[model samples]
Target: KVFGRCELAAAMKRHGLDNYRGYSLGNWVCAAKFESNFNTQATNRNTDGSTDYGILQINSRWWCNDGRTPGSRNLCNIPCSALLSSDITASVNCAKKIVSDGNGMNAWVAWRNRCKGTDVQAWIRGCR
Candidate 1:
């Protein structure tokens, strides 16, 4: 586990996620809650045979090298395993790259399902 709810929010804010890539930090915090509960070791297989990795659940279809996979977009050029760590630097950086690619937070399934059009401010309430 990388953080508790409040600590995650504070860390995100400190990392300059408050208004990253035209999305609010609350959006990220809310997505993180539903995606992995702040667990950095999280991984989930997608229906497309791809996998998501780490805190943001970044997909191997697009972001990182899963190593075993033959083809990887690996836009961040970092190994997926690197994401599954307590340190969040690479994960956060990769997530930023994703958001900046024009998908915004919609890249995260949790964001579209749980955070979109919701009162996400609560995710960062006390920390902000």
Candidate 2:
């Protein structure tokens, strides 16, 4: 689903990602902007032969399955398509588990490359 930046922020807040796992709302917002521009249907294939799903671009290697892949860990126990819907509840819940499983937002390359230690306030600008 597409969202205005403020709408995205508000949705994420209702989903409780504003401060989940010690990550600020800004961090989640920044990651989503760079990862999928808040498009829930967004997906990408990686060089490693795994696919990324949803706004967070979660990897099939350890998160979800595309139903045609083998060796997917599916740690989140949810189908990949479940994350590709306008409702972000499943994706947000899975993301929280992912961060706690390792080094926080380091789970997402976009967060590491684009959002890490940056002044990301602009991502949530105008949202209260």
Candidate 3:
């Protein structure tokens, strides 16, 4: 499913991304825009034999079990398939574990390249 900007922002906040790990909801919103364009089923394969899954682009090598990442940690303890669901809490919760796992939100290049060191408040302005 492709979410509108306001819809995705609301959902991200609803799933507890607002001010999560010192990153504002706007940052998350901006990251999502670049990461997957708010596509719930988005997946990107890394050149290093890993895969990024779902809305937030959780990685298979460290977060989900994809049966192909080889020696995956599966930290989220969920199948990679789970991240593709329209029910985004799994993706959202996995994101929480990601930032909490010492990745510090820098885990995603989308966040870094697109949101880091930027005033992302514009990303969430119309959501209200």
Candidate 4:
């Protein structure tokens, strides 16, 4: 079944993201892979007793702009997941913004190095 506008719209509402800007599935997947891999139920235990969780690897201690910890609760609590549900487009867009400081492509390149294990400068150009 295709995840239509309703599904995407609902996900956006839950995650607290701007659907228009954050709905790029490719970018979202890139962000997830860069952040912590694409484990929707993923969680990481910190040495200081802190936790980072979910697909976006959202850190509970980050004091997110939305002021919610995706780590403390479940996917239900993280606003990023809403748009991120759209797949790589939404997810990568979110990641680009988080890593790039509003710059899209460079943020993607940075994420490629940090998350995808690729040479940041090389980018996908190497693949083709």
On lDDT, the candidate that comes out on top is 3
lDDT of 2 at 24: 88
The global Cα lDDT (0 to 1) of model 4 is: 0.42
Clashing residue pairs in all predictions, respectively, total 0, 1, 0, 18
> What does candidate 2's lDDT look like per residue over 1-128, in tens digits?
88678888888889888878888898999999999998999999888888999989988889887776677788899999998999989899899889898698998899999999998777887777
User: How close is each model in CA RMSD to the real structure?
Assistant: 1.3, 1.0, 0.9, 9.1
Which 10 successive residues of model 1 have the least lDDT summed? 65-74
Q: TM-score of each candidate?
A: 0.93, 0.95, 0.96, 0.37
Instruction: Give stretches of model 1 more than 4 Å off.
Output: none
Those runs of model 2 whose alpha carbons end farther than 4 Å from true positions after fitting are none
Q: Local distance difference test, per candidate?
A: 0.86, 0.88, 0.90, 0.42
Model 3 stretches astray by more than 4 angstroms: none
Query: lDDT for model 2, on a 0 to 1 scale?
Result: 0.88
Cα shift from native, residue 99, model 3 (Å):
0.7
Q: lDDT order of candidates, best first?
A: 3, 2, 1, 4
Q: Tell me model 1's lDDT, rounded to 2 decimals.
A: 0.86
Lowest-sum lDDT 10-residue window in model 3:
99-108
Per residue, candidate 3 scores C-alpha lDDT tens digits across 7-122 of 99999999899999888898888888899999989999998799998889998988899999887789889999999998899999999988887768888898988899898999
Off by over 4 Å in 4: 1-25, 64-112, 115-128
TM-score between model 1 and native: 0.93
